[PDB]
Write an enzyme that holds these catalytic residues in place. Sequence first.
Site, PDB file in Angstrom:
ATOM      1  N   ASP A 173       0.797  -1.074  -0.005  1.00 43.28           N
ATOM      2  CA  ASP A 173       0.017  -0.016   0.079  1.00 43.28           C
ATOM      3  C   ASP A 173       0.901   1.200   0.046  1.00 43.28           C
ATOM      4  O   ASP A 173       1.413   1.539   1.124  1.00 43.28           O
ATOM      5  CB  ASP A 173      -0.859   0.078   1.224  1.00 43.28           C
ATOM      6  CG  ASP A 173      -1.615   1.399   1.633  1.00 43.28           C
ATOM      7  OD1 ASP A 173      -2.445   1.774   0.474  1.00 43.28           O
ATOM      8  OD2 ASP A 173      -1.398   1.772   2.511  1.00 43.28           O
TER       9      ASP A 173
ATOM     10  N   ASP B 113       1.778   5.065   0.467  1.00 42.75           N
ATOM     11  CA  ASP B 113       1.219   6.060   1.191  1.00 42.75           C
ATOM     12  C   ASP B 113       2.198   7.381   1.140  1.00 42.75           C
ATOM     13  O   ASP B 113       2.563   8.061   2.140  1.00 42.75           O
ATOM     14  CB  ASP B 113       1.017   5.737   2.398  1.00 42.75           C
ATOM     15  CG  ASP B 113       0.220   6.714   3.392  1.00 42.75           C
ATOM     16  OD1 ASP B 113      -0.371   7.613   2.832  1.00 42.75           O
ATOM     17  OD2 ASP B 113       0.260   6.519   4.542  1.00 42.75           O
TER      18      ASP B 113
ATOM     19  N   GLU C  23       2.375  11.138   0.713  1.00 39.16           N
ATOM     20  CA  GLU C  23       1.868  12.094   1.139  1.00 39.16           C
ATOM     21  C   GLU C  23       2.408  13.640   0.633  1.00 39.16           C
ATOM     22  O   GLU C  23       2.979  13.962   1.401  1.00 39.16           O
ATOM     23  CB  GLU C  23       1.189  11.988   2.511  1.00 39.16           C
ATOM     24  CG  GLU C  23       0.545  10.900   2.822  1.00 39.16           C
ATOM     25  CD  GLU C  23       0.021  10.518   4.463  1.00 39.16           C
ATOM     26  OE1 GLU C  23      -0.074  11.598   4.884  1.00 39.16           O
ATOM     27  OE2 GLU C  23      -0.435   9.375   4.774  1.00 39.16           O
TER      28      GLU C  23
ATOM     29  N   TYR D 183     -10.093  11.549   6.681  1.00 39.56           N
ATOM     30  CA  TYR D 183      -9.831  11.926   8.188  1.00 39.56           C
ATOM     31  C   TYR D 183      -8.767  12.931   8.025  1.00 39.56           C
ATOM     32  O   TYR D 183      -7.894  13.149   6.911  1.00 39.56           O
ATOM     33  CB  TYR D 183      -9.350  10.592   9.065  1.00 39.56           C
ATOM     34  CG  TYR D 183      -8.520   9.659   8.510  1.00 39.56           C
ATOM     35  CD1 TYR D 183      -7.100   9.988   8.388  1.00 39.56           C
ATOM     36  CD2 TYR D 183      -8.841   8.384   8.089  1.00 39.56           C
ATOM     37  CE1 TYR D 183      -6.206   8.868   7.843  1.00 39.56           C
ATOM     38  CE2 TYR D 183      -8.073   7.513   7.793  1.00 39.56           C
ATOM     39  CZ  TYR D 183      -6.654   7.755   7.596  1.00 39.56           C
ATOM     40  OH  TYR D 183      -5.802   6.832   7.113  1.00 39.56           O
TER      41      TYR D 183
END
Lengths: 339, 339
Positions: A104, A106, A108, A182
């Site tokens: 996965d 991630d 950012e 979130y």
Amino acid sequence: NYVVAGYVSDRHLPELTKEELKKLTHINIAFGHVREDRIQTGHLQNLKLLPELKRENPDLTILLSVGGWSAGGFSEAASTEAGRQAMAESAVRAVTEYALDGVDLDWEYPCYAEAGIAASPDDKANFTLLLRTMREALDRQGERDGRHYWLTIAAGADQYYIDGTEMAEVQRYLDFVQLMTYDMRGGFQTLTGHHTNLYTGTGDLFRISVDASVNLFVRAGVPKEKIVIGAAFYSRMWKDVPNVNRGLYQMSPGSGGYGPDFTELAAEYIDRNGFVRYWDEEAKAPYLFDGQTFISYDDEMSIRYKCDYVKAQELAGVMFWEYGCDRTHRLLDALYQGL
Amino acid sequence: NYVVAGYVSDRHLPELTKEELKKLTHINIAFGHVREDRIQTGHLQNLKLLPELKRENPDLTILLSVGGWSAGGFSEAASTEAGRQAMAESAVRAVTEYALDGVDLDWEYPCYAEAGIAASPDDKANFTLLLRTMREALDRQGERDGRHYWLTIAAGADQYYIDGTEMAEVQRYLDFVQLMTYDMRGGFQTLTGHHTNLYTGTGDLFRISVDASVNLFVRAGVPKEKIVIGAAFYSRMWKDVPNVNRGLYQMSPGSGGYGPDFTELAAEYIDRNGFVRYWDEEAKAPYLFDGQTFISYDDEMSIRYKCDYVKAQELAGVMFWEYGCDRTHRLLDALYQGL
């Protein structure tokens, strides 16, 4: 069937019980890092536990999440063919060295340096090339091993993320896209609001929500059956806010930092110590206010609404950050029951 | 011909010279207030000067701007038929008591209470009804007086404002819509960026700009020939920001408060006292950074780009806040030359 995907820090892997493992479809292990254009796992301590976790729930898919907020090296690696190949090779290394089912990613975020990492406008095209190359390498290893290997991403929720990526192309290489619905209001704004709200509320200058994020990604070309939405087992909190409108949509001198995790909210804050719980019937979100300190969070009520939305809108499922943030075990149970 | 509209505080009216008056097409006098559902002018001191200003430039249109940031009473007045009629009657009173050509309504903003004013979801429909009623009353007075009376608004620039109004209906009652394409990044965010930028820049988590705002309002149904964009004669400023990327898109502990006005920037900050001026070639915006303090502003260069955009896109013109913020007189000259 729906995705029930939990982020679990490597440090929390030994805390997983058989009963909890049977409620999850996926675990995202946080986090591998990027150094020298390659995924690094040497700092992670509990990866030898993975075969036993898979034995306890043979239907569980275990991904290595790579990156996280402030984890650098991605723009650099994606900027050259050599670095994209190195990332792909290191993903293959991860799934052959350990009982991992995939990766996965991630980062950012592509094009954005706000976390203190390198970025470039070239990241928009280079992110697609990176994921294509990683998918190609993982598929070749799956051919050798007679199985499927997974590739997913965690994506930012708001317009900036769409503007920094080519999501219609990106999605083709991914099993699903996890929308990080979130921290949607948090460390960059001094206006209070809901950090993980299902729907956008009237009177908020900021217009993002789970619903608005899903709509953005669908319009950008991500199939609904690939969209996994986000639930938070922790709060965002603003300090020294005027006692107006129950603290909602008020200006703080500072931004919305991390607040208590759900364990601490249940123990110390929810309808306790002067904090009153309110329910926003439009956003479908709970919040706490004591006259001065405003706290936004997810609970069993908002999680049920998120699950009903996933079913009605025919999305893939729900993921959460993070397993260790709720020692009451209630939020994972609510997610499992709702899906 | 294009709109060249300047906000002038009542206190600054005596400073207007004939040469400056001939460069403007409109003056917006700041500010009337709302009390008891009626526009109040009793606190304004220099309204007797208006006939002489009109004598010096007979083509000048002089509007009374009503409201401003933190000016309350609008949601209350708009919430009843009686209050909407009272506002309309008081607008007629203003244009018959003084040499005013109309009213510019500056409610900031329908549905939004963030400025410390009342608000309601009902404001979205009630704002349209309020403007319709005010336009009806002003037109009746224009019929009696054999002339046209003007009604305009100042509108927030970003998505929130579209979501809190019915702009396709609103625009029908207005001579033009002034988009407040300034303070677009400011007191609600701790991330630095351009407060009055023509175009959106790569790597900014916040995606608003003059160009993006115009596009939002056009898509919402405002005719291009009614859109007046905004220029700022003052800065927004963030403190204690990391010395990375020349201060741009960095996190401050606090929000972007007001910085120096253009007078003070020219005297003390632009390429002085450790502050270096940089030009953002994508956003078409200047900024200052000394390693710690980041300042966003408009100058003659960004104003020329804004004027060229107005001409190319066939917009109505440009307005500015505020006359007294630039005692060098250069920014008004740049606007006048550019249009």
